[PDB]
Amino acid sequence: LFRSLVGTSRAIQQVRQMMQQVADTDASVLILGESGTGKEVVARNLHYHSKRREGPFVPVNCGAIPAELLESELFGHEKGAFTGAITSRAGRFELANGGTLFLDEIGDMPLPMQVKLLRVLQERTFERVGSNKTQNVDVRIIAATHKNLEKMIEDGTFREDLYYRLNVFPIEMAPLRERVEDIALLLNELISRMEHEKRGSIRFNSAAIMSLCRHDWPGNVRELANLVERLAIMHPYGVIGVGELPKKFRHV
Amino acid sequence: LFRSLVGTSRAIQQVRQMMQQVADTDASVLILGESGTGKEVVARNLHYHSKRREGPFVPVNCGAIPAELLESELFGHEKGAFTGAITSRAGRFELANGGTLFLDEIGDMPLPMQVKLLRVLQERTFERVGSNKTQNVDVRIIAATHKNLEKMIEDGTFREDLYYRLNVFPIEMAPLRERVEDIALLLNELISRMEHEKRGSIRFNSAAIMSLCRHDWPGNVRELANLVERLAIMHPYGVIGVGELPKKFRHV
Amino acid sequence: LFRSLVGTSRAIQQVRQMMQQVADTDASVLILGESGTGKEVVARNLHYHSKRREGPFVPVNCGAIPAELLESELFGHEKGAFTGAITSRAGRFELANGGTLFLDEIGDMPLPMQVKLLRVLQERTFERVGSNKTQNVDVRIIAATHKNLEKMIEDGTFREDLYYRLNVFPIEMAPLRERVEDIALLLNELISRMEHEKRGSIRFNSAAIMSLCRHDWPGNVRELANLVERLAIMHPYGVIGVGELPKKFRHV
Amino acid sequence: LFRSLVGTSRAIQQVRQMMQQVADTDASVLILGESGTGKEVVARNLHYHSKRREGPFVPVNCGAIPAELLESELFGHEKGAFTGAITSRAGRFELANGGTLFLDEIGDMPLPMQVKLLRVLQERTFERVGSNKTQNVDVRIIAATHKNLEKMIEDGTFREDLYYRLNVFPIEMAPLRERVEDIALLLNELISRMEHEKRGSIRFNSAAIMSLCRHDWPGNVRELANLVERLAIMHPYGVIGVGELPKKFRHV
Amino acid sequence: LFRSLVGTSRAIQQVRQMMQQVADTDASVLILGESGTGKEVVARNLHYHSKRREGPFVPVNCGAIPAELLESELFGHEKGAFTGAITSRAGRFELANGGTLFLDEIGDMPLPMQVKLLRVLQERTFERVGSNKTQNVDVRIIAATHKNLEKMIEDGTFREDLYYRLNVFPIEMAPLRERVEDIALLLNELISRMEHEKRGSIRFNSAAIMSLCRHDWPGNVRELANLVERLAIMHPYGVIGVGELPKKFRHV
Amino acid sequence: LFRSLVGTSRAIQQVRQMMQQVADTDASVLILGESGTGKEVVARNLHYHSKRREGPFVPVNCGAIPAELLESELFGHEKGAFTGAITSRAGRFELANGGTLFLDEIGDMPLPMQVKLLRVLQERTFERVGSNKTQNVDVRIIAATHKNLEKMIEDGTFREDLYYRLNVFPIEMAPLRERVEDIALLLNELISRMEHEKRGSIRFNSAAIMSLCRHDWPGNVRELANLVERLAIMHPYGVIGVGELPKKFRHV
Numbered sequence A, B, C, D, E, F: 001l002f003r004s005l006v007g008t009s010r011a012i013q014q015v016r017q018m019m020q021q022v023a024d025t026d027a028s029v030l031i032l033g034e035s036g037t038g039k040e041v042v043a044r045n046l047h048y049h050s051k052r053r054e055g056p057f058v059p060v061n062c063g064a065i066p067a068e069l070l071e072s073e074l075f076g077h078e079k080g081a082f083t084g085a086i087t088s089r090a091g092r093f094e095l096a097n098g099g100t101l102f103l104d105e106i107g108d109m110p111l112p113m114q115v116k117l118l119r120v121l122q123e124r125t126f127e128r129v130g131s132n133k134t135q136n137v138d139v140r141i142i143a144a145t146h147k148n149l150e151k152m153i154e155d156g157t158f159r160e161d162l163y164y165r166l167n168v169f170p171i172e173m174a175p176l177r178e179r180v181e182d183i184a185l186l187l188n189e190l191i192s193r194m195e196h197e198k199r200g201s202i203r204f205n206s207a208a209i210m211s212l213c214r215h216d217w218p219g220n221v222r223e224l225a226n227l228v229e230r231l232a233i234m235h236p237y238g239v240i241g242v243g244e245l246p247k248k249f250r251h252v
């Protein structure tokens, strides 16, 4: 259902503490961090330690949904509202009612939908597309982005008013290269997962871990997880020394 | 339905007085001010103290609507008028008939629509897109911007004739850093709202308020409101001293 | 339907006389003047005292129409001619057939359209976009600009041949600061309009009028009209002395 | 059922070894290579040396399926879900259950489907379109592309999280011009196939093979195969010298 | 049943020779040439000099069939498979079994069908739409296009793998303006056809033929044939001099 | 049964002469002209001066028939062939056998039917829908369009091969504004028809006719005919002066 946030670093301890405060509340959470830094972990963790911990956790990827269809995605539609509406559709909001709604990559939401998202977050009502029946929403909002929202406000690509509405309780996730002291602990967690799930086993020697601690991690912890995965295929139940690392991971 | 304009400053008192004069009239109101300075408050307040106080308050965000779709947004469309017009559409004007129409960020309206907006404000008739049936409009106009419209007229990005039509009764909203004497009063209002709505409680000590009075407030009163919100999560029913302020807010 | 040109100045009397000569004819009229100087008044007045006084008065704002769409604007289009042409479109020319076509800010027409406008003004036929069916046009041309067309010819931004075609009967409109002797008469007209239309009433005292006669009037008579409007809100049925003028209007 | 990977080059030997490791596992395989480099060979070979070697090998061409229909393609649909759904439809996943699912040109999958593909690869359940019954999936994933996925992640056209999920065990296929030492061996295989299948026979002389080893091979081994085919029509049971090569293949 | 390829030019002699080689074989033939260059002649000629010369010659115009119906066109369908399937349908493949299948304008086949066409050309089996019964196909493939397939591969509008499958034995048909030395011979053939079929008679004088040899022939030999036809109506049993040519055909 | 082509203009005399040549023949006639230019007159006239002058004149409006039903329209159907085929149906071809078949607005025939129309015009046989019994056709083809077929060939919306088949003997009908010298003669014919049929009488004075000669005639001679009709209602047995013309017809 949820994962815990492994790590010994100051920054990761800050996150844990900030998670305890806000989870129980219904404050809107905005999580800032590079891709793979554990933003969805924090979000799903928040939820199950929240007033809505029995209700629905509803993802919405505001960027991977075609702009023309995002309104129908969020509120739903009845029929005839547009070409192809053969049937009725519940939206994310509907499906999230009584739970948390997770707005994944909020910085990719089109401006038209930013406006409508704000009106709903204010009025707490919405119209399905086509229908003019307004409808009540009960949702705990959690949003995540890796974009600089402040710059986007300046560029006129993100709305100031939405921003201040969503950014009530900001949580910043450090990128992996800024918490390399967490790598060993993260490696252990990632390997237990793999073993618990009967996918395989490995472990890393000290030289390897030193080498990994010097890596960039553009893909951060997800990249880390992928590497564990590849090495378990390549050296099942092996020990990984620096010679078992792929070249781009060696830094001696 | 509406909020009142808290504040003790000379400028905010000017606004109140200017609001009393014009509200009862059907003069077009143009409100100039930075984002978060209470322009929508003034507008919604104006409306409910106006001849249309029973009719519809209809927002239109002239910038957050894609340019190609703004004409359909304002006047409506019938069918077939363009790709996707499966159905009929009432426009903002229609929905605003008998009430006030609020043109949010008028300085982001495309030039084509400035022309058509003026013709309607003059002729007081409009065509739905596609249809050639002209239609009567009864609307009290209220517009708001944070852009320098005079410069835009010079740059050829805003029309002179629209400007003089809309700028009958100009209301200027001071930014927060120019009315810091209002901050305590604003804090009290913002906190009563939060308590009345069972979201929480706080209050600020004198040192904190002095510190806040030295802040820039790029996001003005909306930024202020957001800060109250965060601190209510962080210190429920607490007292905020300068050490409870986020670093960027401390100025001693 | 039309307004008359109030004013006692030599220049405004010249315009009146020049209007009498040309109106009855089908000569092309070019009206030069700063924004708000009454160029559209002269044009609409010309029309209803012309051979086409029963036919359509068709505005076209050559600058407020996106360049890529101006050709479709003028001649019309059939279908398929470009992206989005779901339907048929009559152009301004079509709609102006049997009336006058008013080219507002001709100095903002793109060079491609200057060429096509000239060929039509010569051949007196045109193709809808897409179609290759040529079509007959019966239009009295009236154009207006506040740009120096002669300089634009030099800069290569306005065509010499179009210019000489349109500039058959040039009418120059003096800016307001060059006919301040007309201000009182203009004030009276502007106030009767307001009263006739049940919008309010005011009048100005002599000191106020002296002060107004010393003003720059960047927006000329439209600016004047706007001021009358604001003061009618601020001092309904009042008398305006120089203390009732906005500061930028006081010159004693 | 499957082909073996002929070739003496270092790179092709690497592939063979990497194929032995991963085939027996259920790790996701991503194969990178230009068109015609044998990516489908590697995939079909992998399968029949895998835990699913008795189950279904199910191709899906993520680019040749219209975007609007790809969701129905993968998961299936019940009825009424959209226009034309007269009947029920099993999806690729269903048909691949117990076997391997081969995602041909994964880099052409639309972003909406990347999201849904990832959720299924994680949750290991899916909804047929229309239905809300979730369903279990047992599939070994194999994907292939000739696109630079890393650039696409940067361009925002391919998702980072999908990428790291699919790229557990990357196999890179060298283009033919980088393994020209394999051409003779490839020629022999391609000719035995043709003879075994009673389509004809040829062989190449040394001069011809030298000439072929200097060719670009934009279409790589598939292009090679096509050339063998044409020459068997043109010179049945002949010997191909450089004069029997098409001009663009001669390099002396 | 078939026509022979008249002409004295080098290129037309090449075609004849290439036709002799491939006709007897079951190699796939791809014929490239502008519209009216005799691609269907070459195809029908090929067939009756082929192993399938007693079997069915089955045209399919891959562009003139609506995309949504092309799959049913090729493989057939049973019933219920979609809206309107009241009955059973044999596809082109079925009807072509034991003969040649001619894919006219292959470059207009939608990508979905390119994929399915290739799988059938490989597996040599197919499913009628709806049915899941697979079925054996015995067909000699002949395809024709006037499109640049290589560019289409680049544009991602034609598949590389289909291309290399179909392009085993490429036949290029020169446009008429590149074989004007064939025009007289072509004229004689076209006129004998007309006489043999009791439609009329003409012949051309030398001046006329010189004039025709300087023509563009956008429609090539079909255009030529049409001209013969018109002139036989206009000058029955006449002699055509350059004055009997339509203006666009005169080049002296 | 037929009308004669009144008119004194060069172009109308050309048509008459071209009608004499082709009528007696069985050449396919293509008539190009704007709506209302007398294309059906030419066609019906052609027929009764043709080898089929005793047989059936069979109209088919290729655009006003729903695309899905046009095949059944042309060839007929047996039963069961599709939903609703309770009975047998003869097609236009059948009903036209021994006469002329008039393809009205051929440029609106769907591409699928262009293909089938050509095969029939070549093979001279056809299948009723459903049946597989082929059937002999004896028809003289006459087609008419107001579309640019050459452009449609370019746009891929009309087939090149059909075009060259149908365009054996092209007849172009000038629009009315290009033969205004024919208007008086046309008026006389149109009025005699009306009198002969006891519908009324009028005649036009010289001023009126001059005015009509300056009109656009978008609807050409049909528009002319309609005007005669309206004026006979409005001024029975009257004389029409320019004041009896509708405004849009006055040009002095």
Ligand SMILES: Nc1ncnc2c1ncn2[C@@H]1O[C@H](COP(=O)(O)OP(=O)(O)O)[C@@H](O)[C@H]1O
Pocket: A003, A004, A005, A006, A007, A033, A034, A035, A036, A037, A038, A039, A040, A041, A042, A186, A189, A221, A222, A225
């Ligand atoms: N602190 C952490 N402790 C344990 N696992 C983590 C941590 N941070 C990230 N992960 C794991 O890393 C991977 C990607 O994290 P994810 O939450 O998807 O990041 P994001 O949403 O920011 O891209 C998942 O496997 C996740 O469980």
Ligand SMILES: Nc1ncnc2c1ncn2[C@@H]1O[C@H](COP(=O)(O)OP(=O)(O)O)[C@@H](O)[C@H]1O
Pocket: B003, B004, B005, B006, B007, B033, B034, B035, B036, B037, B038, B039, B040, B041, B042, B186, B189, B221, B222, B225
């Ligand atoms: N003078 C004021 N008194 C009370 N509340 C105010 C005042 N000015 C602004 N607010 C509050 O500040 C926030 C933002 O104001 P808003 O009207 O949205 O500004 P704008 O439209 O200019 O961005 C809202 O919470 C609003 O109620």
Ligand SMILES: Nc1ncnc2c1ncn2[C@@H]1O[C@H](COP(=O)(O)OP(=O)(O)O)[C@@H](O)[C@H]1O
Pocket: C003, C004, C005, C006, C007, C033, C034, C035, C036, C037, C038, C039, C040, C041, C042, C186, C189, C221, C222, C225
């Ligand atoms: N001489 C005049 N007499 C009366 N009204 C005038 C005169 N000149 C201008 N106006 C008024 O001034 C305003 C703007 O004039 P307009 O014709 O729009 O100028 P332009 O087209 O040059 O910008 C309108 O209210 C118009 O009726």
Ligand SMILES: Nc1ncnc2c1ncn2[C@@H]1O[C@H](COP(=O)(O)OP(=O)(O)O)[C@@H](O)[C@H]1O
Pocket: D003, D004, D005, D006, D007, D033, D034, D035, D036, D037, D038, D039, D040, D041, D042, D186, D189, D221, D222, D225
């Ligand atoms: N190493 C190899 N040994 C034998 N045949 C090969 C090899 N590589 C490719 N082929 C053959 O080349 C052709 C195209 O390969 P394919 O697997 O379709 O490549 P891709 O899927 O990358 O386009 C097929 O005929 C295939 O059997």
Ligand SMILES: Nc1ncnc2c1ncn2[C@@H]1O[C@H](COP(=O)(O)OP(=O)(O)O)[C@@H](O)[C@H]1O
Pocket: E003, E004, E005, E006, E007, E033, E034, E035, E036, E037, E038, E039, E040, E041, E042, E186, E189, E221, E222, E225
């Ligand atoms: N070399 C040739 N000899 C005789 N007739 C030819 C020749 N090439 C084309 N034709 C004739 O030209 C016309 C059109 O040719 P067609 O095969 O339909 O070309 P395509 O299929 O390339 O459009 C037909 O009348 C055909 O018989």
Ligand SMILES: Nc1ncnc2c1ncn2[C@@H]1O[C@H](COP(=O)(O)OP(=O)(O)O)[C@@H](O)[C@H]1O
Pocket: F003, F004, F005, F006, F007, F033, F034, F035, F036, F037, F038, F039, F040, F041, F042, F186, F189, F221, F222, F225
């Ligand atoms: N040259 C002509 N002489 C007499 N009548 C004509 C002539 N041309 C057109 N008409 C008449 O004009 C009307 C419309 O012509 P029609 O043949 O229907 O044109 P189309 O088929 O091109 O639309 C009919 O009343 C027809 O009889």
